[PDB]
Design a protein around this ligand. Structure first.
Ligand SMILES: OC[C@H]1O[C@H](O)[C@H](O)[C@@H](O)[C@@H]1O
Length: 453
């Protein structure tokens, strides 16, 4: 049969995306070597994986209560949230009270740091206006999801933008300062910026009240990263040898020194070469929702060239960079051969899809998505296995808090991810939980502990 012949040929093109268990162990071990290097004074500057100290400590610590503004920059949108923090019969609960999401126009994104933060300030103002509380002066917590060198919980230098951010005059500067300045320049409201955390960190924190075993935070959204509670004595960059501190791996930059060269496909190199940060964030580029749809687009385009898809004719849309969105990937079924959604997606893209085109698009989506899950699983496994060694436990029971557009909305991803992590982590009992408003709530909780002065 003809449609079978096309699918066999497709499958041989997509086999390239496979990763054997030994490929994943190789990646996992390489990741562990970079983590080791990032944690040590002598190799920290040259590590691809930076392992940044967050100054979020395991020490039970005094907390204020009340209302906090949480800002969240670094996902799809910028989010502003009122969060209530209070004491419970056990620990400290947090509850989202109000929330608004804002898109950020491309210009405010690739202009100056000042434009970007001015834009941020307008949105905050708009949200204060909506709830008539421009008069109040709140403690603000800032989830800012990019590589930051912290000197403390409320002072951090941006190391570099990732995920397509390009605002000039931001790198090397104090991010909290940029925000305070922008709010200052505006006038119509006041805020005490008291904390700044990575999204991985906020997410971990948000999950503590419900499960004291949560010591890993993971994000698979636009970007991909993880934080974990490291033995204070292994944190060579911070004085102290008791208890634990949250380390922000910034594992997205894994591969930035060649570590992944043998696994990169032409689609990967194409995506990297055309990105805002070529040569950087190579691991993230295999996984992140910012890149996943675009990888799929390049695969489809290859299949068209081989005359296996769309009768070798691609609409101008499909030939447009970024036209295949990541959400389309998540709107693609798996265990059921449903073609409805794919047919609609592809029609809107200006294509006349056959039943067979749909099935092939679904396989392309599965292939890219599945390799993302597998690659991601080697990183988390590397982390968790290392914690097991570092805590010298025969069996380690650990809870991982997860957030992000991709883990939450891609059902096939979640399942492939869990199974792969688990095969790679013998003698660890891993519980996964999806945080709810993890970024907003996590940030308020940190702000609460910071306000207590
Ligand atoms: O949003 C998930 C991740 O995306 C990018 O990797 C950012 O550099 C990192 O800080 C963030 O945690």
């Amino acid at each position: 049969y003809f449609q079978g012949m096309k699918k066999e040929k497709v499958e041989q093109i997509l086999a390239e995306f496979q990763l054997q268990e030994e490929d994943l162990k190789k990646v996992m071990r390489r990741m562990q070597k970079e983590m080791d290097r990032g944690l040590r004074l002598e190799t920290h500057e040259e590590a691809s994986v930076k392992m940044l100290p967050t100054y979020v400590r395991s020490t039970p610590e005094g907390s204020e209560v009340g209302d906090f503004l949480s800002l969240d920059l670094g996902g799809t949108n910028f989010r502003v949230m009122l969060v209530k923090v209070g004491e419970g019969e056990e620990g400290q609960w947090s509850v989202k009270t109000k929330h608004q999401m804002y898109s950020i126009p491309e210009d405010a994104m690739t202009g100056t740091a000042e434009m970007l933060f001015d834009y941020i300030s307008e949105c905050i103002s708009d949200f204060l206006d909506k709830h008539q509380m421009k008069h109040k002066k709140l403690p603000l917590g800032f989830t800012f999801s990019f590589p930051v060198r912290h000197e403390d919980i409320d002072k951090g230098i941006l190391l570099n933008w990732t995920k397509g951010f390009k605002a000039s005059g931001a790198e090397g500067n104090n991010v909290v300062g940029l925000l305070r300045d922008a709010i200052k320049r505006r006038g119509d409201f006041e805020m005490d910026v008291v904390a700044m955390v990575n999204d991985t960190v906020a997410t971990m924190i948000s999950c503590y009240y419900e499960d004291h075993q949560c010591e890993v935070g993971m994000i698979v959204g636009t970007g991909c990263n993880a934080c974990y509670m490291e033995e204070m004595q292994n944190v060579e960059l911070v004085e102290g040898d008791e208890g634990r501190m949250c380390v922000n791996t910034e594992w997205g930059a894994f591969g930035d020194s060649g570590e992944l060269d043998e696994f990169l496909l032409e689609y990967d190199r194409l995506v990297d070469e055309s990105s805002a940060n070529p040569g950087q964030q190579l691991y993230e580029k295999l996984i992140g929702g910012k890149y996943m749809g675009e990888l799929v687009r390049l695969v489809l385009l290859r299949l068209v060239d081989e005359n296996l898809l769309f009768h070798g004719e691609a609409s101008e849309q499909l030939r447009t960079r970024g036209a295949f969105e990541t959400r389309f990937v998540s709107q693609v079924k798996s265990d059921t051969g449903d073609r409805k959604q794919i047919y609609n997606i592809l029609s809107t893209l200006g294509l006349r899809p056959s039943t067979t085109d749909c099935d092939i698009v679904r396989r392309a989506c599965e292939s890219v998505s599945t390799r993302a899950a597998h690659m991601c699983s080697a990183g988390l496994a590397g982390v968790i296995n290392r914690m097991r060694e570092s805590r010298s436990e025969d069996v380690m029971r650990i809870t991982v808090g997860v957030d992000g557009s991709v883990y939450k909305l891609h059902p096939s991803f979640k399942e492939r991810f869990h199974a792969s992590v688990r095969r790679l982590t013998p003698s660890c009992e891993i519980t996964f939980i999806e945080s709810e408003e993890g970024s907003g709530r996590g940030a308020a909780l940190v702000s609460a502990v910071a306000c207590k002065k």
